Design a protein around this ligand. Structure first.
Ligand SMILES: O=c1[nH]c(N2CCOCC2)nc(N[C@@H]2CCCNC2)c1-c1nc2ccccc2s1
Length: 289
């Protein structure tokens, strides 16, 4: 698949000169951290998300080329759709289909007054995100940064996996440049190993965030790291019912326990004991069915 080459000045013009101001006051900024800032824009009769990239300038160009490579090979309903790019101007830009419901992290934290996600919507999001990871693993790609901030939500709250800049083709390797988000990383990924089993572990943390509505890491909380609740529950001090997000009215114990069981299996500290993505996908389908 081939993409449209956008002019930097067209992207600069539709995003109000890449405004740092947010949604309310009159700017276009939609979020940052994923090695760039995402801005809202309107191009060729469509609402778009324009990611202006902003380690080394060469490493940032490597991730720009990697994102296009992965997106050229990988088209799926549970991956964000790349509409084009821009290399001509000062800053590297990636253009996507606009995701009106932001990220799963934003929606789990009810950022900007949005209503809490229902258990019914959370199940669809978990299944959709697992279908997106399955498609990546089937095409021998390792995401390397699976987290709720990288699961975007469209007009129908369909889960769309994003950020393929750090993605690696497999088609267990070792690396000197350890990348990803600490609170979601498998022990072997924190040591430099590159394997699709690390994406399964990170997805297990995403499933706990979905059940609990709690962020993967919170400086003002005990445990500070969400993955530690797996041990508090296993060493029967608590149960998953004590951790269910109170901001839901439709969560039943049976399906929550079925999602928690998938998460627990994903979070096995030994990479070879974790289920593969097809098994995770099967278990999430049986939970609903
Ligand atoms: O299209 C988008 N809309 C919004 N909304 C729209 C509604 O108002 C709030 C902002 N947020 C986005 N991402 C950020 C990511 C960081 C955390 N917060 C959300 C995207 C995309 N972000 C990306 C990122 C990579 C690839 C494609 C896309 S599309």
């Amino acid at each position: 698949t081939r993409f449209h080459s956008f002019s930097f000045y067209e992207l600069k013009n539709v995003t109000n000169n890449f405004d740092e101001r947010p949604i309310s006051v009159g700017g276009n900024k939609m979020g940052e951290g994923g090695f760039g800032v995402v801005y809202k824009g309107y191009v060729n009769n469509t609402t778009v998300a324009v990611k202006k990239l902003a380690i080394t300038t060469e490493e940032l160009k490597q991730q720009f080329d990697q994102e296009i490579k992965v997106m050229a090979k990988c088209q799926h309903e549970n991956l964000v759709e790349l509409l084009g790019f821009s290399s001509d101007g000062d800053d590297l830009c990636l253009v996507y289909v606009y995701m009106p419901n932001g990220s799963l992290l934003d929606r789990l934290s009810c950022l900007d007054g949005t209503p809490p996600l229902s258990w019914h919507m959370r199940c669809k999001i978990a299944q959709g995100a697992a279908n997106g990871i399955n498609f990546l693993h089937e095409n021998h790609h390792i995401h390397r940064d699976i987290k709720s901030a990288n699961i975007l939500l469209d007009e129908a709250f369909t889960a769309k996996i994003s950020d393929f800049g750090l993605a690696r083709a497999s088609e267990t390797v070792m690396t000197s440049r350890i990348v990803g988000t600490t609170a979601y990383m498998a022990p072997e990924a924190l040591r430099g190993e590159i394997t699709p089993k690390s994406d399964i572990y990170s997805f297990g943390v995403v499933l706990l965030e979905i059940i609990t509505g709690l962020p993967a890491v919170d400086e003002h909380r005990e445990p500070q790291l969400l993955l530690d609740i797996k041990e508090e529950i296993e060493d029967e001090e608590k149960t998953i019912e004590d951790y269910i997000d109170k901001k839901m009215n439709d969560a039943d114990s049976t399906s929550v326990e079925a999602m928690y069981s998938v998460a627990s299996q994903c979070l096995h500290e030994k990479k070879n004991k974790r289920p593969d993505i097809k098994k995770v996908q099967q278990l999430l389908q049986e939970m609903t069915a």
